[PDB]
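Budget justification note: compute hours in this period were largely spent on complex prediction jobs such as the one shown. Inputs:
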Amino acid sequence: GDTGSLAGLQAMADSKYTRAQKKQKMGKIREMALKETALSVGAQAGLAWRAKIIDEQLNKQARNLDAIYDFNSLVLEHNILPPVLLEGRNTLNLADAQSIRISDRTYKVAKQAHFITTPPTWRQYLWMDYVKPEAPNVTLLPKTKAEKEIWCIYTERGWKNGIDQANTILEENIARIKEDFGGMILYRKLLAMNMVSPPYVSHTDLGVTGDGSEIHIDDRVLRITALPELNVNSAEWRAAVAK
Amino acid sequence: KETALSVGAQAGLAWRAKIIDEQLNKQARNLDAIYDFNSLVLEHNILPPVLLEGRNTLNLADAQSIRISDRTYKVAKQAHFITTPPTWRQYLWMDYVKPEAPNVTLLPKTKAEKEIWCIYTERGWKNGIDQANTILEENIARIKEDFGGMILYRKLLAMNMVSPPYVSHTDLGVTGDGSEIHIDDRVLRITALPELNVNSAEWRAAVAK
Amino acid sequence: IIKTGDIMFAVLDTSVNSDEPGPILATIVTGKLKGSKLIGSFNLPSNADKMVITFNTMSIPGAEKTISISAYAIDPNTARTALASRTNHHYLMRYGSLFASSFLQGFGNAFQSANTTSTLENAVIGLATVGKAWSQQAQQLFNTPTTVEVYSGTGLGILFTQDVT
Amino acid sequence: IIKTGDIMFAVLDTSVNSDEPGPILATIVTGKLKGSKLIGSFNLPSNADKMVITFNTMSIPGAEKTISISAYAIDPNTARTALASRTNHHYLMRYGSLFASSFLQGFGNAFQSANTTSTLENAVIGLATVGKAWSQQAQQLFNTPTTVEVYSGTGLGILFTQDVT
Amino acid sequence: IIKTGDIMFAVLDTSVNSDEPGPILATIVTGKLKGSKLIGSFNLPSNADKMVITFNTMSIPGAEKTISISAYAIDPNTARTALASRTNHHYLMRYGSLFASSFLQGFGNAFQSANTTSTLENAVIGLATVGKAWSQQAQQLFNTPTTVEVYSGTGLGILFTQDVT
Amino acid sequence: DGCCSKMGGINYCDSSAGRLVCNNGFYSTCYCTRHAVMDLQFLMGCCLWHGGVYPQLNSSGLVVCNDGYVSEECSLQK
Amino acid sequence: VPKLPCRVDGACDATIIKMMTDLNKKGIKVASVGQNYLISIPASALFADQSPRLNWASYSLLNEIAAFLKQFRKIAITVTSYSSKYVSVKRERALTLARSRVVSEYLWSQGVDSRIIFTQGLGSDKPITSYTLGGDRSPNARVEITFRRAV
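Corresponding output:
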């Protein structure tokens, strides 16, 4: 070896290692073709298998998820979704030398409130898709037992990689839906604190309408006039206390 | 053979790199003990600037021309904001990648070839040792210069040789539109970098007992 | 940028006997270019002591370009130009057919000649007349050489000739 | 965009003997192109070492386009270019006819020459005179090669040469 | 600047037999140009007492330029132009084939001749008739030369002809 | 390799902690998650405490970090 | 991952249960519940009568205790000392304090993988067994170590 390389380069002067180090070139150039395919098929099969395991474990806990992600408690009285809010505390940034800016808190409107027909569930957020691949295509095949076994263990490596990929996708979905739910509950908190504007929507009605051929008995339309937004009137904010 | 001494130099350089990295890792606590940059910072999270000294300056520019002075000082790097104090690993942890691929183009076949391989690999090994030691010496001299510059600014400021840096801070209330808000706006800018004062009349003496 | 005439590898997946050259493609699996695949052909030799592969249509995936490097092939892990195949395909078939035709001709004529000094007559008959036509047809077919055949799982070397980018 | 020199699968459902070339079509069942089919033709080699199909007229259904990507053929699951058929079709018939005409000629001449040292003479007569005409006719007709014939139920593989869109 | 007619070392790592010339590269290890690599070929002389390497296509690392300084080859640590190869490759094969065919023909004819003054007759048969065709085919194939073969573990020399930058 | 030896055997890998839990109710000292707390002081690679390796390959033997510094020890020498 | 640290250094739960079984069948008390770990020792195996001095055989037990406590990963160690009622309050409090001091110093001198050491001595103010016949031969006179295992 090259670690204790004085003894190593004294030892690798042996002529048997000269004729044994030559024969690994074709083995390397064949094994590197084998291992990427092994990793690919292990990644595919393990990823699909882990995905459907996650899907059926999700299906086993159907009641509690729909319990905890209740948007029907979250909706507003004109069938209008609350907006999404993000917050941050103790912000600072250096822009360059002799250029600093700090702020205690900041708040951001992420997605504007809008009209909704049906309340969203959690299933579209937390469902993972499942395509079973029934076509394992192996063009290059190993020759002897050693390359077969290292092909097997590198397939195991790809299997682990596909499992980790599925886990990362799952937690990213969890983060996204948690962020949206937190934005809704932030809107409820700010509406309680009176630092934001409630949404105002007007409506106008007409009686019987239409021609002699097509009629509606009534015709009520509604348009939102005032979107929710934050205020800057600092003295007009109500605080909170506990006991 | 020349490639053999080259790869021996590679092996010796990597081996001394690993040895010196183990030895440096052995003394982690004392390095952070002695290089207290976090004490050496100033109150506005600002790095104090770097100064260099010089005593008994003489130059012979040419014939009929001599310029001498007693002492002089130099601003090396101006003061600036910092975020986290630097550590010794930013200057002392020398890099290491082990080369494990000696492609022997010249395999030995005679015992004389083995012997000359041994002696030239030994020469490369020693050369790698010397190079690694030179690299370490360069790095430690550099970081010694940095710490000395910081300490030199501190004591010249103690001796009233440099004005301290001056910072103006402006604070504003709430800001933004109805969608984006920051609740307070504190902006700090350093309007006066440290610099030498040529009016020597303000200088003050020093004694010991 | 490829330096003028350095060493690369390719992995061969499909085989052919050296009879009708055509598009045969390898896949470069390591190096600067990944996923690249390369079409080419071979040449027909008079003497079967080695066999080379000439590669011309090199394409890299990702973008639509077609660089036009011409290169040769060597057998790797020996660093020589020989091909790992068989060279003794049809020596013995034509040799034995010709020698049997000869032996038939000789049997009919010599055991006809030794008559002075019915079944053995019919032996003379059959050998005497089926020696001749088979002898001239064996001299007709004696000229087909021994071919070689590359294999569909043997890697190969690509030593370059010109520069591409 | 197709990579320059990849491998596709084609479905062979019709057979042809290797005697008259013609537009023979296979159907690609894989890849991006669905319902696509490709016509081409075969060639007759001098020696029967392998038999292959060249493919040129490629059609993608739905829209009116007809690309002309050229490709060669390989035997599936062998990664080789040979054809699975028969090759011993017409060796034995011409061999037997020629050698029988020979044996007749030899019987007449040698069993007439052994006369010095009725029905037996008529046997010599019949072989003597019917040998030679059949001998020259068989030497006339010996030139026909053994025919091969592809099947109507074994598909094949296709390796690309150029790019299309 | 390279002086007109000085000597440079090169490391040769890939081998060839002298049957098919082609691009072959070497690695210059010393001098000004380090990491440089040079392609060329060989030639077949009339007598195989030497083998030289033409080397023209030279590449220097760093810059994307290919100079074409041309030079020839000598054997390292020999100071001679001979090649370390083998000479006696294919004399004895054709020698033995020819002399065996001649002996066959001679045995058949002379032991037919010695009849005046069954099994020995069949010896006459086989030897007489299979001597002749193998004799003419041996004189046909006698003219294949014995090639030389470089080896892939010894470098070579380069003696300069012109000046480059 | 068998981490819950001389115990109840393995139960699972608590990935909230990134540690194996055995059938015995004790925390196994082996790790099973990349996202878990190690205690490591040694590193590999070169151009460290810098921008890493520059993505382009220099024609000469020099290597360079992304902040412009040149690592002569990782670089090939004469 | 093979380049990555597969386990902690010198981690073997077989050795863990081996040394804790040896200590429990030896007689020094070691108890584990949750993450909280307590080890109690009687002073008769540690000192002489009413004396903050160490006998030379006790360093074997100190080495065993150090080998046990270095096996885990932790932050804070708390040791405490308890005495019999001998003369006063001051003398017993100072004796407990000194014993805690010397055992803490030897532990820090050895290879402890902890960052905080706390010593506290009390004396004869938190007894365990109301049977108080013996002096330093009493089981109540004792020294305890405690920690919480960290992750």
